[PDB]
Amino acid sequence: HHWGYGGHNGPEHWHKDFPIAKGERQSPVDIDTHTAKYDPSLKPLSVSYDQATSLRILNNGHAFNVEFDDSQDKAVLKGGPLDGTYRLIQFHFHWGSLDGQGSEHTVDKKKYAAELHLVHWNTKYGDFGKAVQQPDGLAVLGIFLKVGSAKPGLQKVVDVLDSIKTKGKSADFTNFDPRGLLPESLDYWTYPGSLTTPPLLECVTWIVLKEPISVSSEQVLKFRKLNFNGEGEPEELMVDNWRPAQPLKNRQIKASFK
Numbered sequence: 001h002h003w004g005y006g007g008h009n010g011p012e013h014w015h016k017d018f019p020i021a022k023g024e025r026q027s028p029v030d031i032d033t034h035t036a037k038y039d040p041s042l043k044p045l046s047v048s049y050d051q052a053t054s055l056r057i058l059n060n061g062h063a064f065n066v067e068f069d070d071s072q073d074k075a076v077l078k079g080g081p082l083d084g085t086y087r088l089i090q091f092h093f094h095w096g097s098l099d100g101q102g103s104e105h106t107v108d109k110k111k112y113a114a115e116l117h118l119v120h121w122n123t124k125y126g127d128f129g130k131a132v133q134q135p136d137g138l139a140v141l142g143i144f145l146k147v148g149s150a151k152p153g154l155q156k157v158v159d160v161l162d163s164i165k166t167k168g169k170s171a172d173f174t175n176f177d178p179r180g181l182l183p184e185s186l187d188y189w190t191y192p193g194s195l196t197t198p199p200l201l202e203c204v205t206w207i208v209l210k211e212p213i214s215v216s217s218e219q220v221l222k223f224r225k226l227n228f229n230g231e232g233e234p235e236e237l238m239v240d241n242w243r244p245a246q247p248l249k250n251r252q253i254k255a256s257f258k
């Protein structure tokens with residue numbers, strides 16, 4: 001695999017190795033707020049993170065992943081548009097070189113500085129690798145980041161980045177509480193889509209929170225000091241690791257809120 005975010009290997013190129021890039025259920029999308037329908041039949045999201053076990057943080061050359069023990073229902077997402085129980089596997093972010101870009105979803109064409117993806121897989125499939133092959137395999141909680149006041153519960157993340165600067169580096173990351181990444185409100189939009197990274201598999205129920213979290217400018221500047229490259233290689237700052245909005249096609253975005 002040789003994909004990335006650069007002009008030579010970025011999203012406009014992905015379709016050659018991953019033809020599903022041009023499919024019917026691709027993510028991210030622009031969320032047109034006047035067209036999204038309130039669906040009174042959507043439940044409240046159930047985010048049950050009390051028993052989450054974070055383990056490790058890894059620079060994978062595209063983003064950094066905070067990984068969880070998904071060998072048991074500890075940290076699970078249920079309810080909302082979902083049937084069944086979905087285990088948290090990892091979260092990661094997408095961000096820009098500057099605060100005007102970075103999110104993958106957009107809201108009435110507005111871009112946020114960053115977007116957090118909490119990735120969960122459906123336990124009916126047993127493992128992540130099986131879940132990505134199924135149309136209801138993943139549930140991804142997306143959360144926008146704007147820049148303003150610092151998010152206190154992000155700082156433990158930002159503080160360790162210095163130690164995973166380059167691709168393949170990992171560090172212990174136990175006893176991180178992901179509840180500290182959530183806004184107050186769980187109001188959400190939902191639609192059927194895909195992973196936003198190759199292999200771009202069409203296996204995701206998207207749940208995108210309406211309320212952004214605020215992070216400081218120092219927090220997000222520290223994200224932009226990471227590297228896409230390996231140790232000792234030509235430094236390529238890990239910035240603009242976002243896929244742009246894709247066609248909505250034959251899809252309905254639903255709102256949980258009037």
Ligand SMILES: [O-][Cl+3]([O-])([O-])[O-]
Binds near residue numbers: 007008009
């Ligand atoms: O040089 Cl391109 O990235 O247009 O193929």
Ligand SMILES: [O-][Cl+3]([O-])([O-])[O-]
Binds near residue numbers: 155156157159160
């Ligand atoms: O003290 Cl920290 O913000 O690194 O957890």
Ligand SMILES: [O-][Cl+3]([O-])([O-])[O-]
Binds near residue numbers: 117119140195196
């Ligand atoms: O964050 Cl994704 O898992 O939907 O690629």
Ligand SMILES: [O-]
Binds near residue numbers: 117195
């Ligand atoms: O992603």
Ligand SMILES: [Zn+2]
Binds near residue numbers: 092094117
């Ligand atoms: Zn993502």
